Amino acid sequence: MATGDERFYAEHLMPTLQGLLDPESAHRLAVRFTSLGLLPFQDSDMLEVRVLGHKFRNPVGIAAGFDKHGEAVDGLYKMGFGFVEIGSVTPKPQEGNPRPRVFRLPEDQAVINRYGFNSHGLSVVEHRLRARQQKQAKLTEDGLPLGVNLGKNKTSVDAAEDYAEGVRVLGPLADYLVVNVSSPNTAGLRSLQGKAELRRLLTKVLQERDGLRRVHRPAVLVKIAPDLTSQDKEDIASVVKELGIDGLIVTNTTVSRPAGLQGALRSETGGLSGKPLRDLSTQTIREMYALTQGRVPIIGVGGVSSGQDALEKIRAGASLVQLYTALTFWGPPVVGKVKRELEALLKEQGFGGVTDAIGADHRR
Ligand SMILES: Cc1cc2nc3c(=O)[nH]c(=O)nc-3n(C[C@H](O)[C@H](O)[C@H](O)COP(=O)(O)O)c2cc1C
Ligand SMILES: C/C(O)=C(\C#N)C(=O)Nc1ccc(C(F)(F)F)cc1
Ligand SMILES: O=C(O)c1cc(=O)[nH]c(=O)[nH]1
């Protein structure tokens, strides 16, 4: 419990917790424990990455969705994440979908969720981040940056204005912002990934970002689905290059249900995460890196539970990776495990550090 032993968590604690609590209760309890700093690896220099205007002490971040309301940021750095992304946050508070809305597929090492952007809203999150703003400035300066992921309200009549409000309110408190246009759980949202709509939306977002004072001006990334057509991907690449978007987060959860899922809850509605998403996400990273000529930083996400999974996404083109669903199976020790395995594999494959491996599959 205090040592952070990989076998104890994986074989005993996590399976027992999963037997006692429904998945949303487990999520809530985990946010509480983490936020209080009740948790069970010294980052080598090889793991440092400079991208998005910042130093990252290691490339393993916590993906959006775990800490939707910015309650557990310090506890997540304490767990060993090199960067934390909170959100998605919507402009006004909203409850999200009815419960149950989160489902485990233990036989598949996967989760399906349909939270529907349950959010405390911008104002609450703004005050929560303001209460630790200078502590975060020091963390960022120390190589531990903070990302804020923005969503839109269910009943909003103007999606772009929702994201612009997010830029104005939380942009000043974030090292990077994410325009989340890839939740599967908000009606109409994924259609904003289409070319004309994306160009209009991101033009407005970047104008708002550019209007912030220079020390409060974050990088802006777009988080995309794993379910895009070839046409969709080509269009996103074109718009991102045309507008000078700072990066992409690849990928959100999938609405697909890969052949072979075994969990009893495989046909629940929602986005699927974890191991069945892993290679779909990796392949989306590979395609987006190629379409952007390796000039647009990618944060790779989807099914990472080991150093090999992280390195495959880095070699496919990610400069940084994130994970969430693996934590629900393996607990806290998985963060240090990914980092230690990633360092060992980089050495084994002749890389001087993470930076050298970024996009390495495209050069062979
Ligand atoms: C319970 C849950 C909630 C999520 N909520 C969000 C969210 O609010 N915003 C977002 O951009 N992604 C959200 N995601 C997606 C994750 O950030 C990540 O893209 C995806 O789960 C793939 O990573 P993983 O396989 O490591 O979980 C959520 C995922 C899960 C499992
Ligand atoms: C949806 C979801 O978050 C869960 C389920 N099911 C869950 O177990 N969460 C969860 C469980 C444990 C941790 C930690 F590692 F930090 F201790 C983090 C998140
Ligand atoms: O709140 C949610 O349902 C949610 C948002 C998102 O971006 N991705 C996801 O899998 N769930």
Side-chain angles (χ1 to χ4, degrees):
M1 289 187 63
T3 307
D5 177 76
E6 302 171 359
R7 291 159 206 179
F8 182 74
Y9 272 92
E11 304 171 36
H12 292 106
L13 202 167
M14 299 305 294
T16 298
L17 174 85
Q18 300 193 315
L20 283 185
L21 293 178
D22 62 289
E24 185 170 346
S25 298
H27 183 186
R28 295 192 65 185
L29 189 62
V31 172
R32 298 194 192 95
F33 269 70
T34 298
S35 72
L36 301 170
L38 316 162
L39 301 157
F41 185 83
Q42 292 268 320
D43 296 334
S44 104
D45 286 358
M46 293 186 67
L47 296 179
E48 186 181 308
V49 176
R50 168 172 278 295
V51 277
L52 298 175
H54 293 283
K55 176 171 76 182
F56 293 70
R57 81 179 298 171
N58 72 66
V60 180
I62 175 69
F66 172 65
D67 189 4
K68 278 172 176 282
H69 326 296
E71 295 172 293
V73 176
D74 292 298
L76 292 160
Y77 293 123
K78 184 174 190 183
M79 203 169 314
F81 290 108
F83 60 108
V84 168
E85 185 175 308
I86 63 162
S88 293
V89 191
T90 57
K92 308 304 165 207
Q94 62 173 38
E95 283 198 297
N97 290 317
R99 297 192 196 192
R101 53 195 181 172
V102 192
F103 303 94
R104 296 185 207 89
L105 281 66
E107 292 90 350
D108 305 302
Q109 296 178 33
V111 165
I112 290 171
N113 84 86
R114 47 170 183 268
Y115 265 120
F117 286 157
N118 57 305
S119 178
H120 293 175
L122 288 171
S123 285
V124 167
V125 177
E126 179 210 323
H127 288 113
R128 195 167 284 145
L129 296 184
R130 278 182 174 183
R132 59 180 294 287
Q133 185 173 10
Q134 291 310 316
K135 175 185 274 189
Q136 183 66 52
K138 293 187 173 65
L139 285 161
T140 298
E141 174 65 27
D142 246 272
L144 294 173
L146 173 68
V148 174
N149 178 315
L150 300 177
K152 60 156 207 143
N153 281 114
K154 184 176 179 181
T155 58
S156 78
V157 184
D158 181 349
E161 185 59 26
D162 274 21
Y163 292 105
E165 286 170 348
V167 174
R168 290 198 289 266
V169 177
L170 296 184
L173 290 149
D175 294 312
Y176 71 83
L177 286 179
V178 185
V179 180
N180 184 8
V181 62
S182 47
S183 179
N185 300 320
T186 290
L189 191 74
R190 291 176 290 150
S191 74
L192 309 162
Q193 294 171 116
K195 199 168 189 176
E197 222 148 299
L198 188 65
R199 182 188 297 102
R200 167 177 273 80
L201 167 70
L202 294 184
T203 292
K204 172 169 185 156
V205 168
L206 294 172
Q207 185 180 298
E208 292 305 293
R209 183 278 301 277
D210 284 347
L212 301 174
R213 291 166 65 95
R214 46 191 40 89
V215 314
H216 291 282
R217 197 178 292 149
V220 171
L221 293 83
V222 181
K223 183 164 180 180
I224 64 177
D227 304 316
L228 297 172
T229 63
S230 295
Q231 178 71 82
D232 290 334
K233 285 176 251 193
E234 163 182 326
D235 288 351
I236 294 164
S238 169
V239 174
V240 161
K241 270 159 4 157
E242 176 194 357
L243 297 186
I245 287 283
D246 299 301
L248 290 169
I249 297 196
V250 186
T251 57
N252 215 308
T253 53
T254 181
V255 300
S256 76
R257 291 295 184 268
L261 292 174
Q262 293 305 304
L265 306 180
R266 70 187 187 189
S267 288
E268 288 292 342
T269 285
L272 174 81
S273 66
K275 195 193 291 298
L277 177 59
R278 181 181 66 204
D279 284 11
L280 183 64
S281 170
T282 298
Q283 292 294 97
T284 307
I285 293 166
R286 197 180 304 290
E287 181 156 11
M288 298 307 300
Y289 186 83
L291 287 169
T292 55
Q293 287 74 52
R295 295 189 197 106
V296 172
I298 290 162
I299 296 185
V301 200
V304 174
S305 181
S306 71
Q308 172 177 304
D309 302 336
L311 184 59
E312 286 187 348
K313 283 178 165 51
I314 289 160
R315 290 180 64 127
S319 292
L320 300 167
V321 299
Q322 299 171 316
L323 59 84
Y324 174 5
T325 296
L327 217 47
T328 82
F329 287 106
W330 309 125
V334 76
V335 182
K337 190 194 88 168
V338 171
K339 297 187 297 176
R340 171 182 79 255
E341 291 173 342
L342 176 58
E343 180 186 349
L345 290 167
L346 289 161
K347 289 173 184 300
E348 179 177 351
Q349 295 178 22
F351 295 112
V354 169
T355 305
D356 295 312
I358 300 167
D361 292 341
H362 294 259
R363 304 193 279 276
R364 60 194 304 289

